[PDB]
Amino acid sequence: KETAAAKFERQHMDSSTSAASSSNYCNQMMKSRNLTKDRCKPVNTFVHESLADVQAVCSQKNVACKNGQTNCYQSYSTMSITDCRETGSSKYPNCAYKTTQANKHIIVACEGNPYVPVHFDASV
Ligand SMILES: O=c1ccn([C@@H]2O[C@@H](CN3CCCC3)[C@H](O)[C@H]2O)c(=O)[nH]1
User: Fold this and answer.
1) Which residues take part in binding substrate?
2) Which is deepest, 7, 75, 97, 110, by most CB within 10 Å?
């Protein structure tokens, strides 16, 4: 069964590319990562850094999570990311997305032993 850590990796990790640089990227990735089966997941971010680097964020700058929990962490360095946002004309099962590449500080929620990312909260 899929752990929270594994779910984070499936939903939010894409180390394979340095920067998502096809306009097709989100359309393909949201589908292949199984984020378009139940519904079109409205908003989702992929991080293009090593797993070790993203995991390291759990020991970085402690910040409040959007939900008010205290277990969020902001990366000290900017990271290569791709935001996927569902278009206004996207209709399930044909989920359509805008692909936006950025370099930003990520904010993740961490839990467990080992202490690892389980939620992507925001980028700033
Ligand atoms: O910059 C972002 C912002 C949000 N998300 C996604 O939406 C978050 C929760 N949202 C769903 C509706 C309530 C808040 C999910 O935890 C995360 O998967 C993201 O991937 N990148």
Assistant:
1) 7, 10, 41-45, 66, 85
2) 97
Q: How determined?
A: X-ray
Instruction: Please indicate whether residue 12 is annotated as part of the active site.
Output: yes
Domain borders along the chain are 1-124
Query: Which of 8, 9, 12, 36 is flagged as catalytic?
Result: 12
Max Cα-Cα span within the chain? 42
61 labeled part of a ligand binding site: no
- Give the three-class secondary structure for 104: strand
Q: At CA 73, angle to CA 70 and CA 74, rounded to 5?
A: 135
Hey, what amino acid is at 16? Answer: S
Would you state the CATH architecture of domain 1-124? Roll (3.10)
Residue 104 labelled as part of a binding site = no
CA pair distance 34, 29, nearest whole angstrom: 8
**Ligand 1 site: residues with CB under 6 angstroms?**
11, 43-45, 119-120, 122-123
Distance 60 CA to ligand 1 centre (A): 20
Resolution stated for this PDB structure, in Å: 1.6
